[PDB]
């Protein structure tokens, strides 16, 4: 069972400026509170392969993903390659829509399922399948909100600060 979630927020910054914020993955470490570290492993026109260090209920976790960036639509399609230990699949999109000249509807979606139990009955040697399912939802819920708000806050900081006065 693949789960689909979407969250949104309204940002008082133009879409082009929100896009600049989304596109700058290395800046995620400075603005995303649960994001410790970001490495660009590979990169070219229209894509970034990235390794992430992020916490998943109280501790630092690692995974890799491909980002495909569509500046004209202002969509970033992400997909995990090497998955978090309780993650079987994880992908989704950041979308910045134009609401008017100065405001953006910002969307982040998640398509995800937990890793299957191993031969010991547990997911990643620790969790019951039911407990891994509920921890993955709680983590997506929590980081979705914190991520959307971190982007909004940084876009509005640049309008106030970086623009003026």
Q: Which region among 37-45, 82-90, 103-111, 154-162 touches a copy of itself (by CB under 8 A)?
A: 103-111
Q: Which helix (H) or strand (E) holds 97?
A: strand 87-100
The residue among 40 and 145 lying less far from a copy of itself, judged by its C-beta, is: 145
Q: Does 115 bind a copy of itself (CB under 8 A)?
A: no
Q: What angle do CA 21, 23, 27 make, to 5 degrees?
A: 60
CB of 46 to a copy of itself, least distance (A): 17
Query: Pattern of binders to K ion over 24-63, x per CB under 5 A?
Result: ---------x-x----------------------------
Q: Does 143 bind K ion (CB under 5 A)?
A: no
Cα–Cα distances in Å, from 28 out to 5, 24, 98?
21, 7, 22
**Of these partners, K ion, a copy of itself, none, which one is at the site of residue 47 (CB under 5 to 8 Å by kind)?**
none
**Of these partners, a copy of itself, K ion, none, which one is at the site of residue 124 (CB under 5 to 8 Å by kind)?**
none
165 upstream amide cis, omega within 30 of 0: yes
Residue in the block written with tokens 């890799």: 64
Question: Following CA atoms 96, 98, 104, 106 in sequence, which dihedral angle do they give, to the nearest 10 degrees?
Answer: -30
Q: Does 99 bind a copy of itself (CB under 8 A)?
A: yes
Q: Does 9 bind a copy of itself (CB under 8 A)?
A: yes
> How far apart are alpha carbons 132 and 118 in whole angstroms?
13
Q: Is the dihedral of CA 150, 20, 98, 74 positive or negative?
A: negative
Contacting a copy of itself within 133-162 (CB under 8 A) = none
Q: Does 29 bind a copy of itself (CB under 8 A)?
A: no
**Of these partners, a copy of itself, K ion, none, which one is at the site of residue 35 (CB under 5 to 8 Å by kind)?**
K ion
> How far apart are alpha carbons 140 and 9 in whole angstroms?
16
Contacting a copy of itself within 35-74 (CB under 8 A) = 73
State the residues that interact with K ion by CB under 5 A: 33, 35
């Amino acid at each position: 069972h693949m789960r689909h979630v979407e969250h949104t927020v309204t940002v008082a910054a133009p879409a082009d400026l929100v896009w600049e914020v989304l596109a700058d993955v290395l800046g995620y470490a400075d603005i995303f509170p649960p994001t410790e570290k970001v490495e660009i492993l590979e990169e070219g026109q229209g894509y970034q392969v990235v390794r992430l260090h992020v916490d998943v209920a109280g501790e630092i976790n690692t995974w890799t993903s491909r980002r495909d960036l569509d500046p004209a639509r202002r969509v970033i399609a992400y997909r995990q390659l090497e998955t978090a230990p309780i993650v079987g699949h994880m992908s989704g999109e950041w979308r910045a829509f134009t609401l008017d000249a100065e405001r953006t509807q910002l969307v982040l979606t998640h398509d995800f399922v937990t890793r299957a139990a191993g031969d010991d009955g547990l997911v990643a040697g620790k969790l019951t399948p039911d407990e891994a399912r509920e921890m993955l939802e709680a983590v997506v819920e929590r980081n979705s909100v914190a991520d959307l708000n971190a982007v909004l806050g940084e876009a509005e900081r640049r309008v106030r600060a970086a623009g003026g006065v």
